[PDB]
Write a protein that binds this DNA or RNA. Sequence first.
RNA 1: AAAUUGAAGAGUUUGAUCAUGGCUCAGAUUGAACGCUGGCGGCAGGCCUAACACAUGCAAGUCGAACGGUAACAGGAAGAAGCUUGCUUCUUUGCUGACGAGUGGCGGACGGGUGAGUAAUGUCUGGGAAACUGCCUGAUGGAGGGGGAUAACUACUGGAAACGGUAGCUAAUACCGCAUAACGUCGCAAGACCAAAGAGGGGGACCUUCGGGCCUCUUGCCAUCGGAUGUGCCCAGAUGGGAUUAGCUAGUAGGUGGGGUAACGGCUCACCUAGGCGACGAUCCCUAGCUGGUCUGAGAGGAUGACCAGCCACACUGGAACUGAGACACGGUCCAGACUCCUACGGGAGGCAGCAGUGGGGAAUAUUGCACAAUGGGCGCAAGCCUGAUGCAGCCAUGCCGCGUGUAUGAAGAAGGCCUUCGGGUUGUAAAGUACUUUCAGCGGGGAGGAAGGGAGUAAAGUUAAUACCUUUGCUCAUUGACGUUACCCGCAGAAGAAGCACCGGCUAACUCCGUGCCAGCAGCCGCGGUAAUACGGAGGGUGCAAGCGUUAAUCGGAAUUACUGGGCGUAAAGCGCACGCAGGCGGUUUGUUAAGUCAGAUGUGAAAUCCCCGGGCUCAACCUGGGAACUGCAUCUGAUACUGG
Lengths: 86, 61, 82, 80, 205
Amino acid sequence: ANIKSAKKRAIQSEKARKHNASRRSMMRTFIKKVYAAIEAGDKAAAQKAFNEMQPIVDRQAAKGLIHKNKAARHKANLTAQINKLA
Amino acid sequence: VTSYIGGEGHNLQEHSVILIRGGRVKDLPGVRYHTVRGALDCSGVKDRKQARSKYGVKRPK
Amino acid sequence: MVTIRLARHGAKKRPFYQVVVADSRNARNGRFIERVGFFNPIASEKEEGTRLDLDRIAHWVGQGATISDRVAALIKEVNKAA
Amino acid sequence: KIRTLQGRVVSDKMEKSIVVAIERFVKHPIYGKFIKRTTKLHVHDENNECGIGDVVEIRECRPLSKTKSWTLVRVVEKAV
Amino acid sequence: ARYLGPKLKLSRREGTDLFLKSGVRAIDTKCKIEQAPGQHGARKPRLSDYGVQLREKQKVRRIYGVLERQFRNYYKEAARLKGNTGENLLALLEGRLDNVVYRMGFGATRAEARQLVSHKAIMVNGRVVNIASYQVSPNDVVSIREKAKKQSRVKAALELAEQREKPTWLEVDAGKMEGTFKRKPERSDLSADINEHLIVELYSK
RNA sequence: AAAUUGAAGAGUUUGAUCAUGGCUCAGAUUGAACGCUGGCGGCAGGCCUAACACAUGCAAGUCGAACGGUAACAGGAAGAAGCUUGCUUCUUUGCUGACGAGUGGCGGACGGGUGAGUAAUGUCUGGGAAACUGCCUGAUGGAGGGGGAUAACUACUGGAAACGGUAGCUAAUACCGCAUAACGUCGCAAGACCAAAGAGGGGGACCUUCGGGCCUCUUGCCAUCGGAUGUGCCCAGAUGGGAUUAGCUAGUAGGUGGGGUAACGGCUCACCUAGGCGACGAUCCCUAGCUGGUCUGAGAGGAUGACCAGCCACACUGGAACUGAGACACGGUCCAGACUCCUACGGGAGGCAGCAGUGGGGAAUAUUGCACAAUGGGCGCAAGCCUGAUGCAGCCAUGCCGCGUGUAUGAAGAAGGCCUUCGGGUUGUAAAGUACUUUCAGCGGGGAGGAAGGGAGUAAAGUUAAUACCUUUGCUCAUUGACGUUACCCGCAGAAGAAGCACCGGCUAACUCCGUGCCAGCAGCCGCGGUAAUACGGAGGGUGCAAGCGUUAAUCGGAAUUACUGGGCGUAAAGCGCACGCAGGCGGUUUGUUAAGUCAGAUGUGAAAUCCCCGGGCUCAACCUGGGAACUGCAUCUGAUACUGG
Ligand SMILES: [Mg+2]
Ligand SMILES: [Mg+2]
Ligand SMILES: [Mg+2]
Ligand SMILES: [Mg+2]
Ligand SMILES: [Mg+2]
Ligand SMILES: [Mg+2]
Ligand SMILES: [Mg+2]
Ligand SMILES: [Mg+2]
Ligand SMILES: [Mg+2]
Ligand SMILES: [Mg+2]
Ligand SMILES: [Mg+2]
Ligand SMILES: [Mg+2]
Ligand SMILES: [Mg+2]
Ligand SMILES: [Mg+2]
Ligand SMILES: [Mg+2]
Ligand SMILES: [Mg+2]
Ligand SMILES: [Mg+2]
Ligand SMILES: [Mg+2]
Ligand SMILES: [Mg+2]
Ligand SMILES: [Mg+2]
Ligand SMILES: [Mg+2]
Ligand SMILES: [Mg+2]
Ligand SMILES: [Mg+2]
Ligand SMILES: [Mg+2]
Ligand SMILES: [Mg+2]
Ligand SMILES: [Mg+2]
Ligand SMILES: [Mg+2]
Ligand SMILES: [Mg+2]
Ligand SMILES: [Mg+2]
Ligand SMILES: [Mg+2]
Ligand SMILES: [Mg+2]
Ligand SMILES: [Mg+2]
Ligand SMILES: [Mg+2]
Ligand SMILES: [Mg+2]
C-alpha cells in the first residue's frame, strides 16, 4: 500500500479477520453439535445442545459477524427439527 | 491507392511523404483521391497568383 | 444524509446557485431530490435575489435534512426581510 | 381492484404449474396497424383444475421459481 | 466587420440611391449612377429569379449597414416573432442604435452614425452604449452626451437632417440633442420601394 | 392572453418531345483536419486513433474533547537541580500549547477517469413484496459490576533491502463472560435467549484516599419501532443487423425436503416428474455502453450518443476472499502470466482508461500554472487540516456573438494600369488635399462585485445552587480574494497598429485582353484546350463571405430514390405457370349482453437539463436566469356504447 491510511487499514482488516475467524468457527461448531444431535434422533440431547447454542448464536447478532435474520432463521430451523424429531 | 498530382510542377518522387484527401478525377479510371499540395513534402506550385490556397503557395510580397 | 445546499449553474465570474436538497454522497451540481428556490450573489437591485421555499425547508428539516452554512445564513436573512 | 390478467392456457404438463398465453391488442407504432402479441407466462397453478384451451385469470404475487411470478385466481370458460 | 471601400459602386450596382451620402451634393452630380460599376456596366443583363432576390437582399443589407450573418440572425428573429415576417424583419433592421440615431438626425450617414455610436457619444436612457446593433425599445431616451454636444459634424448633421424626409415615429429635439422612440414604425411608415417577399423567398432555401 | 408558424428545384439518355429511372449540385450541422490569412473581448470546446507503456510532482486524509507517551519546538505554565541573580539538570506534558510515530474509531464504496466487455444480468417507461441502512432525525428504556493481554517502548537477533522473530513491561471509546432487558428473536402457547463507552468546560457548601466524591450543562454509548436517503430483487412493454444462423436446452422446466442470502428465487444439494424455449425468430456470428438529449427534416422519419446530467461496467490480464452497514474495492489484500526496475543471487518493488506531463500512433487534442478566498466533500464539538473535484489562470480562430481596421468633404473625373472602334470609357470620390472623431491596442490614475462566514468582548433569553460553563438572539473594534495591472470610469496624443480568401460557360451572383495550342492544364455534373478558350495560367474588372475564406470526411434534406403520412407491377424494374389449403389477414344482416381496442374526465408519474412563449441580468448579442407550456408515453379509477372485438 502507498498511502499510510491504506497501509494501516490492511493491518486492521487482517487482524479483524484473525479475530473473527475463531468466533465464527466457534458458533459453527456449536451449530454442528445441534445438527449432530438432531440427526442422532434424541430429543433430550438435541435440546441440551440447542439451549446452550442459542446464547452464542444470539449474542453475536448484536455484536458483528452474524445478523438478526440469520440468527432467527437458524433458531427457527433448529426448533422445527426438534419439534419434528420423534 | 493512386492519387493525382494537381497543378504543374511536382518535386515529389519515391519515398516522399505526402498528404492525401478525397475527391476523384472523372477522366481517369482508378483514381479516387487527390494529393494536397503544401503538405509535409509536397511543395506548392511555383509562381502561383490565383487560388494559391488550393495549391499551398505563400502570399507574394 | 439529505442536505440542503447549493449548486452552481451560472458562468465564469458570474455565479448563480440553485438551492437543492441532495444526498451528501453526490456531486456539487449532480443529482438532487428536489429544487428549493435559488440565490444570486450578484443580483442587481429592484430584482429578486433569494427565493427560498421555507415551507419545504421546514418539511425537510422535520425529516432530518441538515442545512448547510450559506443556506442557513440566508434563511435567517429571508426571515428578517419577511 | 387488484391488477389481474386473463389469458388462455397453453400447457399443463408440470407439477403445480401451467403455461398461460395473453393476447394484448396493440397498435403498430409506425403503420398504425392493430396487431396481437403473445404474452406467454408460467403460472403456479396449485391444485391444477385446468386442462388445455380453457381461459384462466392470474395475478402477480412474488417470484416463486426461476421463471414464474404469477398465480391463478379463478377458472372461467372451463367447459370445452 | 464592416464595408471599407467605395460608397457609390454599391449604389450603382443596385441601380438606386442607397442614401450612403449626406445629401449636400446631388446623387447624379456626385457619380455616374446610371449603370453598374466596372467596365461592363453599359450592357443590360437579364436578371434571374434568384438574381433579383439576391440583389434585393444585398440592397437592403447595404442600406442598413449589416453583414450576412447579422442579417441571417435578424431574419431568424423575424421568423421566430409573430406577425408578418418581412415587416418584423424591417422593423428589427430599423431598430438598431445607429439606424435610430441617423433617423433622429445626429449623424450625416449610416457610417457616421455608427462611428458616433462606437466612439461613446450616444447615450440611451441616460446610459452609455457603444454597440452599433443595440436594439431600442419603445419609449426610450436617446441623447448626445454632454462632451459630444459641441461637435461641428454633429450640429451639421442636425441642420442637414431637416430638408429631407421626417420620420413620424421619433420624438427629436436638437435644442438638447435628444430624442424619443415613440412607437415601432410600420411598413407603410418605412420606405415603399423594398420588396419584402424577395428576402424571405431567398432565405426560405 | 403564448407555447404553429409550415413544404422551391436545377443540370445530364434523344435529330426534337413525354414518362420512368440513375448520378451530381444549391442548404444546415461537426469533439473537425488541411492550404492561405490573421486584431481584440465575452461565452463554450479541446486523445473520436494505441483500454499503447510510463520517467517526475501532487491527487485521503483528519480527529489529544479516546488512549499510553514525549521523538522534534515554544511558553520553559511550573516548584526546579552547581539556578552567571536566567545560567544549566530531572522533568512536569492522567499540568496547560501542542506533538512525530502507536493503538481506536471515522473516511477510503463520495468526489475523478474511460467505454474494453455487455444486444440484455445492461437501459427507459409502469407496477410489486419477500429485506438492509453508518452518517440525519422522532418516541420510549437503560451506561451496573471485572478481567486477560497487545502496539508503542525496552534488550537482543536474521536479511542488502523489503521486512520479521524472541521475554516481559501497559493503556483505553480495542476484546470477552457474568446481572438486569421487552412493543426484540424462536416458539400455537407455556416458556428459552440477546447491550453498553466514556469523555470536555465548570462549580460554593455538603466533602474527601487530598488523586478526589457529588449537581448541572455539552457530546457520545446502547436495545426497539418509526421518517428520509442509498439500495439489493421480480414482473409487463420497448432497445442494431444477419435465416446464405432453424432447432436449442438435462440444473435444463416444474415439484417434495434440506442447506444458503439481510431478503423471494435450482442460488445450491438428494429424490421424482419430461418437461421449457422456438417462424410473434429459439440457438449462433459480427457490431454496439443506454437514456434526457444533438444534427437535419414543416411534419412523420433518418442519422447520432461531442459537452452536461441519470444508470451500468471497468481500473496491466484473469481469478479469489477479508475488513467494512455499504466493495468482491482506481491510488486495499492474496495468487498465477507478461512488462519494467534493485540485488550480496538467497531474495524483492509497480500498475496515470486521475490532474499535469513523457515515449510511440495519428491529420490533429493544451501548462510537469495559482488558491482552498467561495460553492461542496472527508476529519474534527469547535478553531483547525486535506481536497489536480472545484474556483480560477495559459495556448489553439475549434464553434457562437459583438466591435474595429476611420467619418464628412474632396472632378484638376489627378497620375499609372485595363481594354478600345484610338474619338473613349473602367479603376473612381477611388486616390492626393481639407475638416472632424480616438471606439479597440498603449501609457498613467481612480475603483465596485463574487464575502457569506470566523475569532474577541458586551446586553438579553434557555439552564442549575448559581451571577459559574454552554447554546441562541443584537451590538462595537479586529478582520478574508488565487483570480486581480479585475469588470468599469477618467486624462495623453496621434488616423496610426490592424483584411484577407474563394469564384466569374450553365446549374449560381459576377466579363475583357495577354501566354500557350487535345501539350501545358480545370473539373461536383454537363464538359473544355487541335491559334479568337468569357471553362487552362496571368492581368484588368466584377460577385460572395469576412477575421475569416475554400477543399476534404460524416450526417439530414432535396431523394415522392424503401413512399405509414407519400409509388408502381400490359409495354421502363415489377403478377408466382396454375390450383388446393394450415397458421394468419378480413368478413353479410338484427337484437340483448361484456366493455378489450376506441372516446370523455380525474390521479400519480413522465428527473434535472434541452426546445418554445412571456420577462429580467450581463453597455447589445452570444451566455445566464424566473414562471408557463411541452415531455406527443405509461398505470389506475369513474363513465359513454355508435364502430371494431368476445
Ligand atoms: Mg463575426
Ligand atoms: Mg413569422
Ligand atoms: Mg444530346
Ligand atoms: Mg478514448
Ligand atoms: Mg473513445
Ligand atoms: Mg495503460
Ligand atoms: Mg494540493
Ligand atoms: Mg481504494
Ligand atoms: Mg465497446
Ligand atoms: Mg466496543
Ligand atoms: Mg447478558
Ligand atoms: Mg465496562
Ligand atoms: Mg426448496
Ligand atoms: Mg423531407
Ligand atoms: Mg456516454
Ligand atoms: Mg494511479
Ligand atoms: Mg493524464
Ligand atoms: Mg506522429
Ligand atoms: Mg475551500
Ligand atoms: Mg497533502
Ligand atoms: Mg490614364
Ligand atoms: Mg467584496
Ligand atoms: Mg465554373
Ligand atoms: Mg425519404
Ligand atoms: Mg415509382
Ligand atoms: Mg417488363
Ligand atoms: Mg423489355
Ligand atoms: Mg399469370
Ligand atoms: Mg413455378
Ligand atoms: Mg374499455
Ligand atoms: Mg384516455
Ligand atoms: Mg437585456
Ligand atoms: Mg424535463
Ligand atoms: Mg359487437
